[PDB]
Amino acid sequence: YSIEKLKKEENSLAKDYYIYRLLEKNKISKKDAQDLNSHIFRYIGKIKSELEKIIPLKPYINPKYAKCYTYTANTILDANLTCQSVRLNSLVFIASLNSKDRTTLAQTFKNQRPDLTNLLLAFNTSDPMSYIVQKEDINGFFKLYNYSKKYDLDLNTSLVNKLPNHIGFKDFAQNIIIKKENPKFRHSMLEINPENVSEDSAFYLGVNALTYDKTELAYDFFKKAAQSFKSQSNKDNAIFWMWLIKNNEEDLKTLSQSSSLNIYSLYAKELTNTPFPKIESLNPSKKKNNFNMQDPFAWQKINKQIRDANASQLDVLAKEFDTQETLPIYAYILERKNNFKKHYFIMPYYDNIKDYNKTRQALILAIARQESRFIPTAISVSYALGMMQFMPFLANHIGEKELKIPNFDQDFMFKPEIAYYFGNYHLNYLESRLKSPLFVAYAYNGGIGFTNRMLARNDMFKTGKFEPFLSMELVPYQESRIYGKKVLANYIVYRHLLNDSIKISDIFENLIQ
Numbered sequence: 001y002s003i004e005k006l007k008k009e010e011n012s013l014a015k016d017y018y019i020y021r022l023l024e025k026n027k028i029s030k031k032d033a034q035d036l037n038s039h040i041f042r043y044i045g046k047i048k049s050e051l052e053k054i055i056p057l058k059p060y061i062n063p064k065y066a067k068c069y070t071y072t073a074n075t076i077l078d079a080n081l082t083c084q085s086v087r088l089n090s091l092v093f094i095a096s097l098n099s100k101d102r103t104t105l106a107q108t109f110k111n112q113r114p115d116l117t118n119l120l121l122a123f124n125t126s127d128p129m130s131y132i133v134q135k136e137d138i139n140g141f142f143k144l145y146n147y148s149k150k151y152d153l154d155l156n157t158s159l160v161n162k163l164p165n166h167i168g169f170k171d172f173a174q175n176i177i178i179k180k181e182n183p184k185f186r187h188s189m190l191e192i193n194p195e196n197v198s199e200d201s202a203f204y205l206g207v208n209a210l211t212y213d214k215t216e217l218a219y220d221f222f223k224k225a226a227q228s229f230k231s232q233s234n235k236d237n238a239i240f241w242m243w244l245i246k247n248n249e250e251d252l253k254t255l256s257q258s259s260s261l262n263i264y265s266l267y268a269k270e271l272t273n274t275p276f277p278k279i280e281s282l283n284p285s286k287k288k289n290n291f292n293m294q295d296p297f298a299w300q301k302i303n304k305q306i307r308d309a310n311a312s313q314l315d316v317l318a319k320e321f322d323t324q325e326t327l328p329i330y331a332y333i334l335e336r337k338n339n340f341k342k343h344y345f346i347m348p349y350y351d352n353i354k355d356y357n358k359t360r361q362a363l364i365l366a367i368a369r370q371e372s373r374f375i376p377t378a379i380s381v382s383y384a385l386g387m388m389q390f391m392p393f394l395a396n397h398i399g400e401k402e403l404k405i406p407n408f409d410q411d412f413m414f415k416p417e418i419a420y421y422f423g424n425y426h427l428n429y430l431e432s433r434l435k436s437p438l439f440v441a442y443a444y445n446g447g448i449g450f451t452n453r454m455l456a457r458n459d460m461f462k463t464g465k466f467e468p469f470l471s472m473e474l475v476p477y478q479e480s481r482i483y484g485k486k487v488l489a490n491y492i493v494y495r496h497l498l499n500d501s502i503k504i505s506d507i508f509e510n511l512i513q
């Protein structure tokens with residue numbers, strides 16, 4: 001498709017993908033590129049940097065403050081007061097000033113903007129963080145953290161219990177706990193009252209407490225997380241930790257009876273001799289409809305409809321897509337419809353995998369459910385493609401260099417036979433080196449380099465009181481941490497559906513090296 005034809009489609013990730021393909025092949029002229037940011041659904045990452053090699057963006061500085069941006073650190077004392085305060089939003093600008101001018105400006109702003117006064121006078125010391133911490137200036141603290149992660153200091157009980165009220169807190173807590181940085185910040189966050197935190201923050205503070213073997217504080221944080229989490233899946237994760245720490249059998253019972261299917265509820269069910277959860281059986285009698293499952297633009301449009309449909313319209317759409325050809329769309333609608341409460345684990349295009357052994361079938365299906373929900377023309381915000389969500393680079397390496405498919409194009413990843421074939425091929429490479437389906441999942445999503453580096457550490461997936469569960473909470477990329485948990489559940493389930501059951505307890509035993 002030419003640019004003129006793309007311009008006629010609605011804005012979507014598929015349209016972006018195809019504009020991106022033109023850009024990377026140098027087929028977009030400077031003239032085509034004029035009206036073009038208005039044609040881009042999500043102007044972020046590679047499509048933006050590529051478009052900006054043809055047409056840089058001047059923007060942006062707001063017309064009201066333009067004069068403020070004609071001053072430098074050497075002339076900021078000649079700027080009016082508004083201009084001074086605007087430029088002092090930047091800590092780099094503050095760091096750049098000389099100390100005499102930080103004193104002058106600190107006094108200028110003492111009454112009206114003591115937040116600026118504190119940062120100015122902080123930067124006249126050899127440790128701005130320590131100055132800010134002594135004032136208990138909370139906004140100042142997060143501005144400094146964002147300017148530099150390298151500041152690290154012990155924080156008293158009063159100060160740390162103020163940090164959770166700021167929007168920055170959640171990312172701050174997660175970042176330092178998962179990356180094992182800022183040891184003094186980390187230790188200090190043991191004294192946060194569980195009453196002052198909730199949800200993810202409370203959960204991460206529970207993980208923090210375990211790293212210091214404060215099992216009682218950890219319980220209290222996880223319990224607060226369990227009570228406040230919005231998602232049943234996250235709640236189950238929190239209850240699991242409550243159980244593992246204190247072993248109250250009401251916690252395990254509550255976890256075993258969860259309506260969310262996840263590794264924690266699965267494991268609880270196995271520990272209590274509770275039956276495997278019920279899996280819906282979708283078998284439409286109708287064989288096809290009008291819909292093109294190979295048209296990525298048609299998927300973008302129907303997906304927008306489904307995500308915007310009221311309860312009543314989802315019923316109309318469920319009926320229309322209740323065919324064998326559109327089974328992945330049927331199941332997507334039903335999963336959307338029933339409030340994430342019935343369990344849908346379909347096996348589409350099964351002919352292409354029925355010859356692999358059943359364990360391999362289940363790993364493939366497990367990956368595809370998380371990657372795409374089996375939508376053949378699925379496209380990610382990073383333009384990973386098809387049911388198995390291959391990055392174009394790897395798709396081209398396998399397709400052209402390794403398998404020498406004649407006239408290979410990366411869009412072949414939109415074909416189920418290709419998606420499953422390449423997925424099998426890549427999963428053999430990963431599994432040969434990693435063994436565990438959990439490790440394979442991490443490597444599939446985040447790369448084998450990152451996975452090998454995690455497994456080479458002394459403190460990850462080794463022996464320990466709370467292993468391997470603790471390690472699974474400390475996987476350094478969030479996306480991959482979540483992905484692995486999800487794919488592993490899927491794997492258990494599909495192994496069960498294929499009459500190739502395994503106990504999730506055996507999977508967990510094999511994670512400890």
Ligand SMILES: CC(=O)N[C@H]1[C@H](Oc2ccc([N+](=O)[O-])cc2)O[C@H](CO)[C@@H](O[C@@H]2O[C@H](CO)[C@@H](O)[C@H](O)[C@H]2NC(C)=O)[C@@H]1O
Nearest residue numbers: 332333335336370371372373378379380381384389445483
């Ligand atoms: C919270 C959660 O798990 N969300 C997932 C979502 O889950 C549901 C979807 C619909 C319904 N529904 O209809 O109710 C219910 C749940 O499915 C997406 C696939 O469609 C997953 O996207 C994929 O994420 C991968 C990393 O995990 C990434 O490698 C893939 O490139 C990416 N694929 C796409 C097309 O961008 C989401 O993460």
